Amino acid sequence: SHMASMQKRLQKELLALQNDPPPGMTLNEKSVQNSITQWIVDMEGAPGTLYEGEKFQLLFKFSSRYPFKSPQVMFTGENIPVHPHVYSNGHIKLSILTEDWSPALSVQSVCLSIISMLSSCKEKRRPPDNSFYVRTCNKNPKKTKWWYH
Amino acid sequence: ASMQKRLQKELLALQNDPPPGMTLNENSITQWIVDMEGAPGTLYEGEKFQLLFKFSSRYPFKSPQVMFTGENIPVHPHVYSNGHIKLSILTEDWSPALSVQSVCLSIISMLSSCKEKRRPPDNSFYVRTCNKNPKKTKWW
Amino acid sequence: MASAARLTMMWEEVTCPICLDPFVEPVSIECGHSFCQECISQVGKGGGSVCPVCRQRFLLKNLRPNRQLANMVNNLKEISQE
Amino acid sequence: ARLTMMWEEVTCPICLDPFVEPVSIECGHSFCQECISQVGKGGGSVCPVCRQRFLLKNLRPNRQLANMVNNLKEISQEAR
Ligand SMILES: [Zn+2]
Ligand SMILES: [Zn+2]
Ligand SMILES: [Zn+2]
Ligand SMILES: [Zn+2]
């Protein structure tokens, strides 16, 4: 039941992204695991910004309590933007993914915020804690996550 | 204005979509008359009656005065000789959320209520009560 | 017509029962029925009274704005200026 | 022509489906009873849209919204 209603919502959100994607974003459909828990969004940097011409990929991971808990969202692939709120390994520092999260937010709204964050940025710099944070992230054994619950 | 705005919306509703068995005759938005014909399956089929609606300045927060008029008055346990209608919705079950349309429907519901076409137990008494009164002459 | 009538269905559903106009500043009382702020307080002379629709007792201090209803009436005002 | 903007504004922002048993909270924002009670576990939390605080002690049914959603389901009931 929880997951039936969660699947219903997620299905409607995926239809909206395929039929009216935010500017510069596309969902990657060669990743078809019946789109019930993780999908990949191709995103291109915007003209006139520090990321003009760059092609990025966003990973969305939905837990069993979505939308009351926020999805996990990161950059992946091998082109990861250089940005003060994005780590080298692609993790993103954005509290709407944390304590400004509300269930009334959507994938669409998170996508717009990531886009707004890229083109708002005036300094192509990495986060000050980056080398620490990524060294600690390479020592944790989360390899097989059952993680959906 | 809000009251006249309401009354004109209600008046158009009556002229363009009257309740079943109803039609209105003779443009004076303080007082209007609705013709009513008896329905199939009730004891008043085929008879032609007329309803008078009187609206005061506090409408719709106070109830309109509603009565049967003409020389054809139905015989009904909740309807008097003089055309007065014994329906609590016209009195203290009145709410502004009630409408002319809803009052018309309640009367139709009442014509089809009764199993015996009878006069009210208070009928000769009650209309003798009202025949002495100073009357609402010019201003009220 | 092409469910142009469904347009009018939604108009009547956003009609205030007292003024019979689209809700203006719609508020809810305790029973959860909704009215124009100014119609329901025309009713409730004195601080409180009884719901026009269901007769539940209400107090004007317990008014609550119907943000969803206010939000939808203007989306329909926007749509019909075609 | 016709438009389905109609349906968007009778959609609960949590489940993204038409409101079922809609209730209002203190701020006056409306949600499905089941969705906002999921949000307000323990007797309270903050509004998903406005973040004003609320308690489910003061849930109030949105009767206008309940009646409208139901009526629109009827108009939209279609043979397949
Ligand atoms: Zn009103
Ligand atoms: Zn009520
Ligand atoms: Zn819901
Ligand atoms: Zn709110």
Author numbering:
A (entry chain B): -1 to 147
B (entry chain A): 2 to 27, 32 to 145
C (entry chain C): 1 to 82
D (entry chain D): 5 to 84
What's in the article?
TRIM proteins constitute the largest family of RING E3 ligases in mammals. TRIM proteins are the largest family of E3 ligases in mammals. They include the intracellular antibody receptor TRIM21, which is responsible for mediating targeted protein degradation during Trim-Away. Current mechanisms of TRIM catalysis have been informed primarily by experiments on the two antiviral proteins TRIM5 and TRIM21. Both proteins are dimers containing a RING, B Box, coiled-coil and PRYSPRY domains. Multiple E2s have been reported as partners but only depletion of the N-terminal monoubiquitinating E2 Ube2W or the K63-chain forming heterodimer Ube2N/Ube2V2 has been shown to inhibit the cellular function of TRIM527,28 and TRIM2129,30.
RING and Ube2W engage each other via the canonical RING:E2 interface. When comparing the RING in the RING:Ube2W structure to the apo14 and Ube2N~Ub31 -engaged structures, we noted that the N- and C-terminal helices of the RINGs are partly unfolded when bound by Ube2W. While this may reflect differences in crystallization, it could suggest that Ube2W has the potential to destabilize the 4-helix bundle, thereby generating a disordered N-terminus for modification. Even so, this is insufficient to explain how Ube2W can modify the N-terminus of a RING it is bound to, as it is located far away from the E2 active site. We generated models using our RING:Ube2W structure where the ubiquitin is either dissociated (open) or in direct contact (closed) by superposing on the previously determined Ub-RING:Ube2N~Ub:Ube2V2 structure. In our experiment, R-NbGFP efficiently catalyzed monoubiquitination using Ube2W and WT ubiquitin, but ubiquitin mutants I44A and K11E both abolished catalysis. This indicates that TRIM21 RING uses a closed conformation when catalyzing ubiquitination with Ube2W, as was found with Ube2N39.
